């Protein structure tokens, strides 16, 4: 089972500006380094780029995604899928 208590973690360097863009809708894709942060409402609809360690991948946050960390949608390793890699 996961863990939270009552201190959900949201890096302030990826929670304050994300609120800025909320001035009038949303803003084009952003880029954050700390994937430790957790996804929440406000971040919905926006496109945040997580750092896999090599580059920043565009992760379109959705209501269904709310709760999970940004790192969960940013795979570290890279497996080709040696085959027809269909579906």
């Amino acid at each position: 089972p996961r863990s939270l208590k009552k201190g959900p973690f949201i890096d302030l360097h990826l929670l304050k500006k994300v609120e800025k863009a909320v001035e009038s809708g949303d803003k084009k894709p952003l880029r954050t380094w700390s994937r430790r942060s957790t996804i929440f409402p406000n971040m919905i609809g926006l496109t945040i780029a997580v750092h896999n360690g090599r580059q920043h991948v565009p992760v379109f946050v959705t209501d269904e995604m709310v709760g999970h960390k940004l790192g969960e949608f940013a795979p570290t390793r890279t497996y080709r899928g040696h085959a027809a890699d269909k579906k």
Binding site: L12, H13, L14, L15, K16, K17, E19, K20
Partner: protein, 61 residues
């Protein structure tokens, strides 16, 4: 954050000087600040209990 705290910039954008807001000095929270101390409701309490705030004391019943 570092980008939102553009308040530090004395000269406001196209908006008149009225654009300048507040922002907490410790946490940097614009929600609920206390002009007198310039600190937010969350920092004023933490700073209060620590006793770092002079003259300030917890009200009793």
């Amino acid at each position: 954050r570092w980008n939102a705290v553009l308040k530090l910039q004395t000269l406001p954008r196209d908006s008149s000087p009225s654009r300048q807001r507040n922002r907490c000095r410790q946490t940097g929270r614009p929600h609920g600040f206390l002009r007198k101390f310039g600190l937010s409701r969350i920092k004023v309490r933490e700073a209060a209990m620590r006793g770092e705030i002079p003259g300030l004391k917890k009200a009793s019943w």
